[PDB]
Amino acid sequence: TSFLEQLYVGRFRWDLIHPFPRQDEADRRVGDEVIAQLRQLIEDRVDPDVVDREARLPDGLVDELQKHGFLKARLGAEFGGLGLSHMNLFRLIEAAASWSVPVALVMAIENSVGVGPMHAHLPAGPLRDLVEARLRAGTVSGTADTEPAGAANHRRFTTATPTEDGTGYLLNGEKLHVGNAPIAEVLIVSASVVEDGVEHRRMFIVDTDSPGLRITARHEFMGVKGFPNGGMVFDNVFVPNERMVTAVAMVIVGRLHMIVAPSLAIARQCLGWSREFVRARSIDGRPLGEYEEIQRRLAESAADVFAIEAIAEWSLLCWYEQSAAKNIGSVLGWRVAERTMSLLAGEGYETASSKSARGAARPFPLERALRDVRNFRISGGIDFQLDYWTSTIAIFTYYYPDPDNLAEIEANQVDLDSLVGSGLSERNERHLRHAAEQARKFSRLCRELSQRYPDLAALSEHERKLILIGQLSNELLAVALVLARAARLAGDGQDRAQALADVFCTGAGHRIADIWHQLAEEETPDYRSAAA
Amino acid sequence: TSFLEQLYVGRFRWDLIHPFPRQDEADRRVGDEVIAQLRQLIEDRVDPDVVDREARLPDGLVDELQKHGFLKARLGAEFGGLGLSHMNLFRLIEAAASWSVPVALVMAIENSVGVGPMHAHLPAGPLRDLVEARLRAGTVSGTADTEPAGAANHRRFTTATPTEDGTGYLLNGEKLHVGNAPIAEVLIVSASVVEDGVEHRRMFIVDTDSPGLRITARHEFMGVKGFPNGGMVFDNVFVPNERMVTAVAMVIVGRLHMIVAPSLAIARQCLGWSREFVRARSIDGRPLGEYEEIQRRLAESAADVFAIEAIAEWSLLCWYEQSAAKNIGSVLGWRVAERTMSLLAGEGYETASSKSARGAARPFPLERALRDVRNFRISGGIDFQLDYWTSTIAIFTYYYPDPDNLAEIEANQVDLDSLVGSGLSERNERHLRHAAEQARKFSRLCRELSQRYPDLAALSEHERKLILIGQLSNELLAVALVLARAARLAGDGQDRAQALADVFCTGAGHRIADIWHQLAEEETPDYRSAAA
Ligand SMILES: Cc1cc2nc3c(=O)[nH]c(=O)nc-3n(C[C@H](O)[C@H](O)[C@H](O)COP(=O)(O)OP(=O)(O)OC[C@H]3O[C@@H](n4cnc5c(N)ncnc54)[C@H](O)[C@@H]3O)c2cc1C
Ligand SMILES: Cc1cc2nc3c(=O)[nH]c(=O)nc-3n(C[C@H](O)[C@H](O)[C@H](O)COP(=O)(O)OP(=O)(O)OC[C@H]3O[C@@H](n4cnc5c(N)ncnc54)[C@H](O)[C@@H]3O)c2cc1C
């Protein structure tokens, strides 16, 4: 069953996550070999600073990645693929992202939500034969969903009308901010088909060379400069019947690769840059690493990385937890980069090329890292919006008919007896007790709100409270997995894991308290008067 | 006396800030005229997007600013200056920053810490005659203090050794990240003179064309692209005796212009961009401005702007409050820009030129605003470092001998009777009661820490606690001034002020609670093990 699903009804399932899993040693060594090959390739052909300054990937890179099976990492030998586990794909994207995020994002889309991953789901027919033929030949793909109207719209205004002769459909509409679009051979397009008065969302496998399809825009953002990203108009684009697809777990697990892997990569580089800077600097004769606040900030960044690692390992060694991984990964990644900017200060704010030009010891592209990491709280959904959707669509669903374990909620039941054998420190066992108590409190809150509003549609109006509840659920999951991983790695002789776990749960402790304080607001201000 | 100084010893001096001052109407109308002239000039000659993309100001701008007295805004008619009040200079920089921050920063340095502002302090002699001659002719200046060693160092390693013939000094050392350096005619340089075994910090008025002075580096950062910023080597630069200066209120009040004015400008543009985006967008048939979370976020940004306005008006209509204005202004400015990025989402992350290229309705340079605003938590000191220095150098100084008002601290004395006549709402009067109680609690905390460590040097080791205390003092000042300004503007018929005040104090309420929770930490984790 599901740890986070149980957490929503106030159960702290230590037994589901302890002992914390670890990657198979043979599988990890297969990862090590493929990662070494990619690093050789991109370090030879890609200068990340030049890619950022020119906002362009070097000519020939996508080809060379294709020839070595890096755009078919999860496919079998049949397709000239590397047949990597999810854990090893994630590590491959992480490895790419630590050099150039644009390169990582191209690889992430293709190996996550492209026609390659989709192949296995398609039924036998012409479409499946075409995708296979393209994959053998080597293809680049993208998902074209977002419209100017907004991604958060339940409807898609891009229409698919059947042709008079019934052979295919005419696509009409606009797609915005589409990853890989400018280099894509084929796009997975979302469009509405009207069937006798009722609108229906359908997916279409559309060639980019289709007449009436126009890549009008090439999008450049604050970060990920060089990442192929395009907007397009469909003007009566003819799409044969077979090209119409005829689950969403592929999209959720895809976020681990597209969002969390690059977030971890950046968080790791930032920790590296923090340590190198602290090692080489001093204030008033005393080396910078001796000042308490500097020590705490290195600890907090190190603990954040450990937490991104925990959520990533739990997600890919094995559902709702993988949904929360998007926000936990992206936010922790952004925090580390923000913290690192404060630490490196003036040098941190300075561009890599500027520092390189003046022969600086540390030409670290931290400012690029901070601009890039911001993407991952936007791309794949806005953090507060995902926090809202998580609590209304996945937390109050268990309470609206009524909670099945309602007796447990009124009784304030907390199983402290199942946390007895851990291997955790006396402090990390205290963190574990408190998280289990907070789990039960979380459910009691959810019950009061559900009792307070009979209609969910009415409850769904109170967005701030539901966002905070989304956040609270993520904090407790992060604490739980961090303690589980700590117990495991400490058990296998990594004693630093206890300290890292201790730092993170202490911090989470303050964020949880803050979230409760905001939830406990009795009277709301007239924010509508203020907004005007 | 000083409101913030009294706040440090737990006194809430409502009587010192109520009624809140307002700018003289005649003075403000003089501001309106000068601001209109600057806007005409820069809107004609400066394209802010081009300045950002090329990281260069257009040729001739500094001249045209000089010819119209914008680099001598606070000087008298004698010098061809505009003789503006501090409040009007701040508004002039704000007006410039709302168009192009680089332009604002050049003007801010010259009108704050340049040779122009310094003129009045200099004693009669050749140096004063030279500065006057330069100011009449039109000059550009900068302060060269920061060295590769770090700005936070008490010592400066740049040396000034007297010449054998005793006519002047030889300057040797390196300065980093110097504003206006590449366009400066003269620089105010910090350097150490050794007098019979004891080091001494001295200021030198050095011409940039001095042989042995080399502008080796031209610094480009994440934001403020185009802002002239240079690093230099001094190789036995000869400086005549008269060129050696022979208080720091000029630097503190300068921060209002260099840090807070551009922070307010960005915060205001961001609120404007938020409202325009919300007005034009809808989700599921419902316009975006009808969703609670959207309403709250517009309210929180509007309330933040109001708070930056409050600290700015209190600082320039009239010391320690002006020190805290740096952090309050910069942080609130950064929060608004961060909040705005989440709101505008994909469009928000996209560059102005990208959105312009594809004929977007809103080619808003939000991403540029976010990159620029980050500067103001670094430039003029790192936010957490200023929070540390504020509590060790300006909060515990009143408690180390002992607190003069110790009786008040033990007695938990809170004057609720002086807050009776305000004009505030019943909610904003509650906010006022709570701030006065938090003021007293703040002093009781400070007493316990002072009692706990007999030696300040020992107390100064505990950096996290002292930073949090710095933060707590700033939050209560912000609440106090917001309520004071609200009472005044509501009294003069602006009823929205009550709502804006209410939004801000509610938010501050949560930040204060969070700060206390972190202060109340009983046992600390082993962060030194984690840092490694
Ligand atoms: C680098 C990058 C790459 C991308 N690549 C792709 C891609 O390959 N394919 C693709 O399809 N898309 C892609 N996107 C689009 C991205 O997923 C969207 O930008 C994002 O999911 C939503 O952005 P939007 O501008 O459409 O926001 P909207 O959905 O319009 O939201 C606008 C604002 O309103 C808020 N809001 C929305 N609904 C509510 C509500 N009910 N209550 C309160 N507030 C609400 C949102 O949180 C947001 O702050 C990419 C984006 C980026 C930045
Ligand atoms: C755009 C820009 C313009 C600038 N213009 C000028 C200018 O015109 N003139 C000028 O002189 N300078 C200028 N500066 C320099 C700027 O003021 C400094 O960068 C800043 O004050 C300190 O930066 P630093 O790199 O020297 O940091 P450092 O002082 O080396 O600090 C390094 C880190 O250590 C931390 N730290 C320091 N002391 C302690 C302590 N005791 N305990 C714990 N942690 C500590 C700091 O908070 C920081 O995080 C400019 C900077 C920028 C970004």
Numbering used by the authors:
A (entry chain A), B (entry chain A): 7 to 252, 265 to 336, 346 to 559
Sentences from the study reporting this entry:
Epoxomicin is a highly potent natural proteasome inhibitor and the structural scaffold for the anticancer drug carfilzomib. The biosynthesis of its α′,β′‐epoxyketone warhead involves the flavoenzyme EpxF, but a molecular understanding of the key catalytic reaction cascade remained elusive.
Each subunit is composed of an N‐terminal α‐helical bundle, a seven‐stranded β‐sheet, and a C‐terminal α‐helical domain. The 2Fo‐Fc electron density map depicts FAD bound at two distinct catalytic centers located on opposite sides of the oxidoreductase. Notably, the substrate binding loop (residues 253–264) and a flexible region (residues 336–346) are not defined in the electron density map. The adenine moiety of each catalytic FAD is anchored within the dimeric interface, involving residues Ile301, Tyr309, Leu306, Glu490, Gln412, and Phe411. The phosphate groups are coordinated via hydrogen bonds to Arg299 and the peptide main chain atoms of residues 156 to 158. The C2 carbonyl is positioned in a pocket formed by residues 149–152, while the C4 carbonyl oxygen interacts with the backbone NH of Gly185, and N5 is aligned with the backbone of His183. Beyond these FAD interactions, our crystallographic analysis of EpxF revealed a well‐defined water molecule located 4.1 Å from Ser406, 3.3 Å from the Gly407 backbone amide, and 3.6 Å from the C4a atom of the flavin. This water molecule likely mimics the position of a C4a‐hydroperoxide and its geometry suggests that Ser406 may contribute to stabilizing such an intermediate.
